[PDB]
PDB file of C-alpha atoms (C1' of nucleotides) in Angstrom:
ATOM      1  CA  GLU H   1      57.705  40.961  76.697  1.00  0.00           C
ATOM      2  CA  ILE H   2      58.212  44.453  75.373  1.00  0.00           C
ATOM      3  CA  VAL H   3      61.034  45.315  72.998  1.00  0.00           C
ATOM      4  CA  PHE H   4      60.873  48.664  71.258  1.00  0.00           C
ATOM      5  CA  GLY H   5      61.875  50.236  67.958  1.00  0.00           C
ATOM      6  CA  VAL H   6      61.309  53.679  66.416  1.00  0.00           C
ATOM      7  CA  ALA H   7      59.787  53.761  62.908  1.00  0.00           C
ATOM      8  CA  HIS H   8      60.983  57.209  61.930  1.00  0.00           C
ATOM      9  CA  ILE H   9      58.511  57.905  59.041  1.00  0.00           C
ATOM     10  CA  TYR H  10      59.814  60.875  57.120  1.00  0.00           C
ATOM     11  CA  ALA H  11      56.620  61.325  55.222  1.00  0.00           C
ATOM     12  CA  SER H  12      57.878  63.865  52.753  1.00  0.00           C
ATOM     13  CA  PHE H  13      56.446  64.876  49.423  1.00  0.00           C
ATOM     14  CA  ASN H  14      57.761  62.799  46.566  1.00  0.00           C
ATOM     15  CA  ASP H  15      59.324  60.142  48.867  1.00  0.00           C
ATOM     16  CA  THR H  16      58.616  58.348  52.145  1.00  0.00           C
ATOM     17  CA  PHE H  17      61.413  57.121  54.373  1.00  0.00           C
ATOM     18  CA  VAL H  18      60.306  54.144  56.545  1.00  0.00           C
ATOM     19  CA  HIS H  19      63.587  53.839  58.330  1.00  0.00           C
ATOM     20  CA  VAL H  20      63.235  51.954  61.639  1.00  0.00           C
ATOM     21  CA  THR H  21      66.005  52.149  64.127  1.00  0.00           C
ATOM     22  CA  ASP H  22      66.848  51.011  67.681  1.00  0.00           C
ATOM     23  CA  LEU H  23      65.526  53.086  70.573  1.00  0.00           C
ATOM     24  CA  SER H  24      68.365  55.578  70.580  1.00  0.00           C
ATOM     25  CA  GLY H  25      68.496  55.913  66.861  1.00  0.00           C
ATOM     26  CA  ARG H  26      72.208  55.462  66.526  1.00  0.00           C
ATOM     27  CA  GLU H  27      71.650  51.955  65.049  1.00  0.00           C
ATOM     28  CA  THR H  28      69.518  51.544  61.972  1.00  0.00           C
ATOM     29  CA  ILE H  29      67.654  48.485  60.726  1.00  0.00           C
ATOM     30  CA  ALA H  30      66.159  48.045  57.299  1.00  0.00           C
ATOM     31  CA  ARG H  31      66.717  51.405  55.651  1.00  0.00           C
ATOM     32  CA  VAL H  32      63.767  50.931  53.164  1.00  0.00           C
ATOM     33  CA  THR H  33      62.308  54.038  51.733  1.00  0.00           C
ATOM     34  CA  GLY H  34      59.595  54.349  49.115  1.00  0.00           C
ATOM     35  CA  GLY H  35      62.062  55.205  46.449  1.00  0.00           C
ATOM     36  CA  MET H  36      63.777  51.873  46.244  1.00  0.00           C
ATOM     37  CA  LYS H  37      60.567  50.047  45.165  1.00  0.00           C
ATOM     38  CA  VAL H  38      58.967  51.780  42.203  1.00  0.00           C
ATOM     39  CA  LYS H  39      61.053  53.898  39.795  1.00  0.00           C
ATOM     40  CA  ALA H  40      58.941  56.336  37.833  1.00  0.00           C
ATOM     41  CA  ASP H  41      59.919  59.535  39.798  1.00  0.00           C
ATOM     42  CA  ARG H  42      56.240  60.553  40.265  1.00  0.00           C
ATOM     43  CA  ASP H  43      54.484  57.629  42.049  1.00  0.00           C
ATOM     44  CA  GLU H  44      57.109  57.868  44.855  1.00  0.00           C
ATOM     45  CA  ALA H  45      54.665  60.166  46.610  1.00  0.00           C
ATOM     46  CA  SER H  46      51.836  57.707  46.365  1.00  0.00           C
ATOM     47  CA  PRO H  47      50.328  55.946  49.408  1.00  0.00           C
ATOM     48  CA  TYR H  48      50.772  52.653  47.685  1.00  0.00           C
ATOM     49  CA  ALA H  49      54.530  53.012  47.731  1.00  0.00           C
ATOM     50  CA  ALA H  50      54.186  53.835  51.370  1.00  0.00           C
ATOM     51  CA  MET H  51      51.913  50.861  51.631  1.00  0.00           C
ATOM     52  CA  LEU H  52      54.257  48.132  50.464  1.00  0.00           C
ATOM     53  CA  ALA H  53      57.560  49.675  51.634  1.00  0.00           C
ATOM     54  CA  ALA H  54      56.420  50.020  55.194  1.00  0.00           C
ATOM     55  CA  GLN H  55      55.579  46.400  55.915  1.00  0.00           C
ATOM     56  CA  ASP H  56      58.645  45.603  53.821  1.00  0.00           C
ATOM     57  CA  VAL H  57      60.465  46.836  56.932  1.00  0.00           C
ATOM     58  CA  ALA H  58      58.141  44.657  59.037  1.00  0.00           C
ATOM     59  CA  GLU H  59      59.760  41.452  57.946  1.00  0.00           C
ATOM     60  CA  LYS H  60      63.304  42.669  58.514  1.00  0.00           C
ATOM     61  CA  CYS H  61      62.609  43.847  62.019  1.00  0.00           C
ATOM     62  CA  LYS H  62      61.386  40.321  62.705  1.00  0.00           C
ATOM     63  CA  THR H  63      64.837  39.020  61.613  1.00  0.00           C
ATOM     64  CA  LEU H  64      66.026  40.546  64.920  1.00  0.00           C
ATOM     65  CA  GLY H  65      62.586  40.136  66.579  1.00  0.00           C
ATOM     66  CA  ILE H  66      61.331  43.507  67.849  1.00  0.00           C
ATOM     67  CA  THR H  67      57.625  43.132  68.565  1.00  0.00           C
ATOM     68  CA  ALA H  68      56.597  46.605  69.552  1.00  0.00           C
ATOM     69  CA  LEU H  69      57.770  49.933  68.220  1.00  0.00           C
ATOM     70  CA  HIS H  70      57.185  53.653  68.141  1.00  0.00           C
ATOM     71  CA  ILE H  71      56.371  56.059  65.310  1.00  0.00           C
ATOM     72  CA  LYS H  72      57.953  59.465  64.398  1.00  0.00           C
ATOM     73  CA  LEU H  73      56.145  61.356  61.591  1.00  0.00           C
ATOM     74  CA  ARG H  74      58.116  64.023  59.867  1.00  0.00           C
ATOM     75  CA  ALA H  75      56.659  66.564  57.516  1.00  0.00           C
ATOM     76  CA  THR H  76      59.316  67.737  56.156  1.00  0.00           C
ATOM     77  CA  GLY H  77      58.943  71.302  57.513  1.00  0.00           C
ATOM     78  CA  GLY H  78      61.718  73.518  58.452  1.00  0.00           C
ATOM     79  CA  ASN H  79      61.129  76.666  56.455  1.00  0.00           C
ATOM     80  CA  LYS H  80      58.867  74.354  54.425  1.00  0.00           C
ATOM     81  CA  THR H  81      55.521  72.548  54.245  1.00  0.00           C
ATOM     82  CA  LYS H  82      55.275  71.547  57.964  1.00  0.00           C
ATOM     83  CA  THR H  83      52.628  68.831  57.404  1.00  0.00           C
ATOM     84  CA  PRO H  84      53.106  65.218  56.138  1.00  0.00           C
ATOM     85  CA  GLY H  85      52.456  64.327  52.528  1.00  0.00           C
ATOM     86  CA  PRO H  86      50.090  61.845  50.751  1.00  0.00           C
ATOM     87  CA  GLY H  87      51.705  58.616  51.762  1.00  0.00           C
ATOM     88  CA  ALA H  88      51.883  59.515  55.378  1.00  0.00           C
ATOM     89  CA  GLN H  89      49.869  57.133  57.523  1.00  0.00           C
ATOM     90  CA  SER H  90      49.098  54.626  54.813  1.00  0.00           C
ATOM     91  CA  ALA H  91      52.474  53.514  56.024  1.00  0.00           C
ATOM     92  CA  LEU H  92      50.805  53.295  59.449  1.00  0.00           C
ATOM     93  CA  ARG H  93      47.922  51.071  58.420  1.00  0.00           C
ATOM     94  CA  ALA H  94      50.569  48.977  56.616  1.00  0.00           C
ATOM     95  CA  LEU H  95      52.446  48.433  59.872  1.00  0.00           C
ATOM     96  CA  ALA H  96      49.681  47.653  62.270  1.00  0.00           C
ATOM     97  CA  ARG H  97      48.011  45.222  59.863  1.00  0.00           C
ATOM     98  CA  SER H  98      51.463  43.474  59.522  1.00  0.00           C
ATOM     99  CA  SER H  99      51.429  41.962  63.073  1.00  0.00           C
ATOM    100  CA  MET H 100      52.971  44.851  65.010  1.00  0.00           C
ATOM    101  CA  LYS H 101      52.182  46.358  68.354  1.00  0.00           C
ATOM    102  CA  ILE H 102      52.239  50.097  67.835  1.00  0.00           C
ATOM    103  CA  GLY H 103      51.943  52.369  70.697  1.00  0.00           C
ATOM    104  CA  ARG H 104      53.572  55.687  70.340  1.00  0.00           C
ATOM    105  CA  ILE H 105      52.602  58.201  67.540  1.00  0.00           C
ATOM    106  CA  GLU H 106      54.236  61.635  67.487  1.00  0.00           C
ATOM    107  CA  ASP H 107      54.732  64.460  65.090  1.00  0.00           C
ATOM    108  CA  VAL H 108      58.475  65.076  65.389  1.00  0.00           C
ATOM    109  CA  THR H 109      58.845  67.512  62.706  1.00  0.00           C
ATOM    110  CA  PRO H 110      60.396  70.556  64.416  1.00  0.00           C
ATOM    111  CA  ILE H 111      59.207  74.090  63.764  1.00  0.00           C
ATOM    112  CA  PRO H 112      61.470  77.184  63.868  1.00  0.00           C
ATOM    113  CA  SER H 113      61.206  80.194  66.080  1.00  0.00           C
ATOM    114  CA  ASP H 114      61.347  81.944  62.758  1.00  0.00           C
ATOM    115  CA  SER H 115      62.792  80.917  59.461  1.00  0.00           C
ATOM    116  CA  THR H 116      65.860  82.322  57.852  1.00  0.00           C
ATOM    117  CA  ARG H 117      64.567  82.936  54.410  1.00  0.00           C
ATOM    118  CA  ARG H 118      62.844  80.439  52.154  1.00  0.00           C
ATOM    119  CA  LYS H 119      63.008  79.736  48.403  1.00  0.00           C
ATOM    120  CA  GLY H 120      60.963  81.701  45.950  1.00  0.00           C
ATOM    121  CA  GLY H 121      61.506  85.397  46.308  1.00  0.00           C
ATOM    122  CA  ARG H 122      58.477  87.561  47.448  1.00  0.00           C
ATOM    123  CA  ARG H 123      56.114  86.602  44.571  1.00  0.00           C
ATOM    124  CA  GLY H 124      57.143  83.012  44.649  1.00  0.00           C
ATOM    125  CA  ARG H 125      56.193  80.070  42.355  1.00  0.00           C
ATOM    126  CA  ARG H 126      54.687  82.019  39.455  1.00  0.00           C
ATOM    127  CA  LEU H 127      52.877  79.290  37.348  1.00  0.00           C
TER     128      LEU H 127
ATOM    129  C1'   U P   1      57.129 190.497  98.113  1.00  0.00           C
ATOM    130  C1'   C P   2      53.330 189.197  93.683  1.00  0.00           C
ATOM    131  C1'   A P   3      57.130 185.936  91.628  1.00  0.00           C
ATOM    132  C1'   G P   4      53.051 184.529  84.497  1.00  0.00           C
ATOM    133  C1'   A P   5      55.695 180.138  84.484  1.00  0.00           C
ATOM    134  C1'   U P   6      59.065 176.117  86.101  1.00  0.00           C
ATOM    135  C1'   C P   7      61.961 171.872  89.954  1.00  0.00           C
ATOM    136  C1'   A P   8      60.978 169.401  93.949  1.00  0.00           C
ATOM    137  C1'   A P   9      56.867 169.402  98.666  1.00  0.00           C
ATOM    138  C1'   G P  10      57.969 170.041 105.794  1.00  0.00           C
ATOM    139  C1'   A P  11      57.577 162.852 102.941  1.00  0.00           C
ATOM    140  C1'   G P  12      55.782 160.428 108.368  1.00  0.00           C
ATOM    141  C1'   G P  13      49.650 161.800 106.882  1.00  0.00           C
ATOM    142  C1'   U P  14      44.070 161.924 105.162  1.00  0.00           C
ATOM    143  C1'   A P  15      42.355 158.377 100.443  1.00  0.00           C
ATOM    144  C1'   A P  16      37.764 150.232 100.562  1.00  0.00           C
ATOM    145  C1'   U P  17      45.733 152.616  98.694  1.00  0.00           C
ATOM    146  C1'   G P  18      46.475 149.434  93.659  1.00  0.00           C
ATOM    147  C1'   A P  19      47.285 142.173  90.864  1.00  0.00           C
ATOM    148  C1'   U P  20      39.613 140.554  86.680  1.00  0.00           C
ATOM    149  C1'   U P  21      38.684 135.522  85.151  1.00  0.00           C
ATOM    150  C1'   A P  22      41.051 130.820  85.641  1.00  0.00           C
ATOM    151  C1'   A P  23      38.765 128.879  79.167  1.00  0.00           C
ATOM    152  C1'   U P  24      35.399 120.902  78.648  1.00  0.00           C
ATOM    153  C1'   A P  25      42.648 127.004  75.483  1.00  0.00           C
ATOM    154  C1'   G P  26      47.720 125.957  76.456  1.00  0.00           C
ATOM    155  C1'   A P  27      51.935 125.182  79.348  1.00  0.00           C
ATOM    156  C1'   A P  28      54.434 123.177  83.597  1.00  0.00           C
ATOM    157  C1'   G P  29      54.180 120.327  88.129  1.00  0.00           C
ATOM    158  C1'   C P  30      52.770 116.240  91.327  1.00  0.00           C
ATOM    159  C1'   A P  31      53.354 112.649  98.032  1.00  0.00           C
ATOM    160  C1'   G P  32      50.902 110.742  91.474  1.00  0.00           C
ATOM    161  C1'   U P  33      49.329 105.500  90.044  1.00  0.00           C
ATOM    162  C1'   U P  34      50.325 103.550  85.858  1.00  0.00           C
ATOM    163  C1'   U P  35      50.341 101.793  80.756  1.00  0.00           C
ATOM    164  C1'   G P  36      52.424 100.655  75.380  1.00  0.00           C
ATOM    165  C1'   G P  37      56.016  95.153  69.395  1.00  0.00           C
ATOM    166  C1'   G P  38      57.858 103.703  71.188  1.00  0.00           C
ATOM    167  C1'   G P  39      63.724 104.961  70.490  1.00  0.00           C
ATOM    168  C1'   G P  40      69.141 103.794  72.552  1.00  0.00           C
ATOM    169  C1'   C P  41      72.768 100.653  74.865  1.00  0.00           C
ATOM    170  C1'   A P  42      74.365  96.253  77.180  1.00  0.00           C
ATOM    171  C1'   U P  43      72.722  91.244  78.363  1.00  0.00           C
ATOM    172  C1'   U P  44      70.291  86.634  76.815  1.00  0.00           C
ATOM    173  C1'   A P  45      67.160  82.728  74.983  1.00  0.00           C
ATOM    174  C1'   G P  46      64.670  79.753  71.164  1.00  0.00           C
ATOM    175  C1'   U P  47      64.082  76.062  67.594  1.00  0.00           C
ATOM    176  C1'   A P  48      65.324  76.003  62.627  1.00  0.00           C
ATOM    177  C1'   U P  49      68.514  76.342  58.123  1.00  0.00           C
ATOM    178  C1'   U P  50      73.363  75.285  56.805  1.00  0.00           C
ATOM    179  C1'   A P  51      78.484  73.535  56.996  1.00  0.00           C
ATOM    180  C1'   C P  52      81.505  70.014  59.177  1.00  0.00           C
ATOM    181  C1'   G P  53      82.979  65.483  63.222  1.00  0.00           C
ATOM    182  C1'   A P  54      81.803  60.821  64.817  1.00  0.00           C
ATOM    183  C1'   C P  55      78.462  56.199  64.152  1.00  0.00           C
ATOM    184  C1'   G P  56      74.761  52.939  61.974  1.00  0.00           C
ATOM    185  C1'   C P  57      72.791  51.835  57.342  1.00  0.00           C
ATOM    186  C1'   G P  58      72.750  50.392  52.482  1.00  0.00           C
ATOM    187  C1'   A P  59      71.634  52.811  46.795  1.00  0.00           C
ATOM    188  C1'   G P  60      69.802  55.976  45.985  1.00  0.00           C
ATOM    189  C1'   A P  61      68.754  61.438  46.664  1.00  0.00           C
ATOM    190  C1'   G P  62      67.353  66.589  45.059  1.00  0.00           C
ATOM    191  C1'   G P  63      63.693  68.214  42.593  1.00  0.00           C
ATOM    192  C1'   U P  64      59.351  68.723  38.779  1.00  0.00           C
ATOM    193  C1'   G P  65      53.545  69.449  34.637  1.00  0.00           C
ATOM    194  C1'   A P  66      57.003  65.601  32.855  1.00  0.00           C
ATOM    195  C1'   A P  67      61.742  66.464  33.329  1.00  0.00           C
ATOM    196  C1'   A P  68      66.863  67.153  33.192  1.00  0.00           C
ATOM    197  C1'   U P  69      70.815  70.126  35.382  1.00  0.00           C
ATOM    198  C1'   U P  70      72.731  68.435  40.472  1.00  0.00           C
ATOM    199  C1'   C P  71      74.377  65.302  44.941  1.00  0.00           C
ATOM    200  C1'   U P  72      76.309  59.398  45.729  1.00  0.00           C
ATOM    201  C1'   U P  73      86.268  57.644  44.185  1.00  0.00           C
ATOM    202  C1'   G P  74      80.002  53.817  46.831  1.00  0.00           C
ATOM    203  C1'   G P  75      79.927  55.710  53.256  1.00  0.00           C
ATOM    204  C1'   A P  76      75.142  60.156  49.986  1.00  0.00           C
ATOM    205  C1'   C P  77      69.798  60.596  51.257  1.00  0.00           C
ATOM    206  C1'   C P  78      68.323  59.134  56.175  1.00  0.00           C
ATOM    207  C1'   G P  79      68.786  58.166  61.417  1.00  0.00           C
ATOM    208  C1'   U P  80      71.765  60.123  65.392  1.00  0.00           C
TER     209        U P  80
END
RNA sequence: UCAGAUCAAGAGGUAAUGAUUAAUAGAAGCAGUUUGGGGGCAUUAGUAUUACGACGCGAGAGGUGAAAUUCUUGGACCGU
């Protein structure tokens, strides 16, 4: 008895996208991100928004009944931060405590063989 | 003839018969073995960032000190 989903945690800064799909990813279930729960624009980064809006997906994957699933952490690095934010794996302790069978955890942010040009301009982010 | 001098000697014979070193200077070579993101021209790969095409999804998303500008004629963001 092993049916499998893919969690696709896009653990960005100032949001968190807990968007489980089917195994091929063409078919999405329960689009719930951390933005659709609290609306104050600056606790969307918080691990508590990734706490509740991750196991919020765990009920709606039991509407179709998928016991086991896989994880895909994303950072959101392209020419950018390349490591997951604050509410990154607080959305992983949310899932495994919510009666799930989690084996696969992978960092599927991709990294370039060199970036085009990033924002900021040679002395970037003064103040 | 001596010819003050001055050109060339019967040249085949008698002279140790004549070219210093090779610079922990340089240069050039090599049956030389290589070595280096050195320069040129072709060839070719890598993910990424876009922009679009399909398809699923459903109301958010960018961003920030807090914001707003901005993106959702929902089909965006996200997943592919």
